[PDB]
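Cont'd.
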Amino acid sequence: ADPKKVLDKAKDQAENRVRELKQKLEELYKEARKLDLTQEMRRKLELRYIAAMLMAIGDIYNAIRQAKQEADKLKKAGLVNSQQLDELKRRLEELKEEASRKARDYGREFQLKLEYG
Amino acid sequence: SAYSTREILLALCIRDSRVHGNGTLHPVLELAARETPLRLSPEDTVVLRYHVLLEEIIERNSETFTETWNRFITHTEHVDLDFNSVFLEIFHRGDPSLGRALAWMAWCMHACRTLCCNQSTPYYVVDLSVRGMLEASEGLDGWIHQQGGWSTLIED
C-alpha cells in the first residue's frame, strides 16, 4: 500500500532469513564440539555449512526480488512517482547489502570456531 | 524450451570460460559438451541473461563464495558425492525457488571458474567436479519443468 510497507516487510524477511542462518550455524558448532566426532562427521558439518550459506544468499535474493516486484506494481498502479520508485529500490539494495554482510560474517565466525573450537 | 539444468549450467560454464583466465576451454568442458550432447549455444539469449544474473550474485557474495569453495575443495577424493550432498542439502524438502537455484548455479559456475583457470588443479579434480555439479543439478529439472522452463522463470 506504500513504500514504507514494502521496505518494512522486506527488512523483516531479510532479518528473519539472517537469523535462521545464525541459528543453523550455532547448531552446527554445537555438533562440532562433540567428542569423538569422526572425519566423516566433520565433513558432513562442513557440507551443511555451505548449504546453509547458499540457502541464506538465495533467500535474501528472493525477499529483495519480491519487494522490487511489489515496488514495480506501485509504479504501474500510479501510486509512486519516478523519484519514489528509485529511492525505494535504492533502499532495498542497501538492505540487501547489509544482510549480505551479516551472512558473510556469520560464516567467517563459524569457520574460525571450527578451526580452533 | 530450456528444460535441462545440465545443459544451461554447462552452456553458462562455457560462456564464463571465455570471460576468464586464458580464455581457452578446459578439455573436461569440451568432453561434457560432446557427451551431453549440448544443444544450447553459449550465445543463446537465455544463457546470456542468466550469465548476467549469476555474475551479479558472484560479485555481491564473492567473499562467501571463495571461503565456501575453499572449504569444499580441501577434500578432493569424493568431490562428485559432495556436490550431490550439498545440492540435496539445499533442495531435499522439495521447495526450490529462483533465488536458491541462482545461488546454487552461481556457486557452481564460480567453482568451475576457480578450477579451470588454475594451472595447478589436477585434471581428475576438474573432471570429478564438473561431472559432480552437472549430475547434481539435474535434480532441479522437475521443478523447472513445472515453472515452464528456465526462460519463463525469469519473466515474472
